[PDB]
Fold this sequence. Notes:
alpha/beta; four-stranded parallel beta sheet
Amino acid sequence: MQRGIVWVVDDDSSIRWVLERALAGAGLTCTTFENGNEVLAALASKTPDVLLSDIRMPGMDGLALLKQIKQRHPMLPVIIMTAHSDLDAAVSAYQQGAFDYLPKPFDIDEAVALVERAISHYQE
């Protein structure tokens, strides 16, 4: 149905693949990037229904651009990926009106369903 597009912004192949193949098999678009600054503008295109940043950029700390997603797209459910040194911050920081994040690595089975939880929250 493609009622909810999901984009990705990681600095690794195996990191984007998982998020890609996950949608590739389902009925949802899949857009993988390599720079958060390049994704922020992408939203102005068609505006995704949810994104999953793995946080693997030298300049940005992953949440850097994610901090604007709450101001620009408040009704847009986002997801954070990292698990390691990052959650400790995302816990309170991401709590600034964000949806339960998902630490990586993880099980695509739970991920594919996690994204649908944000898109179904409105459609259902």
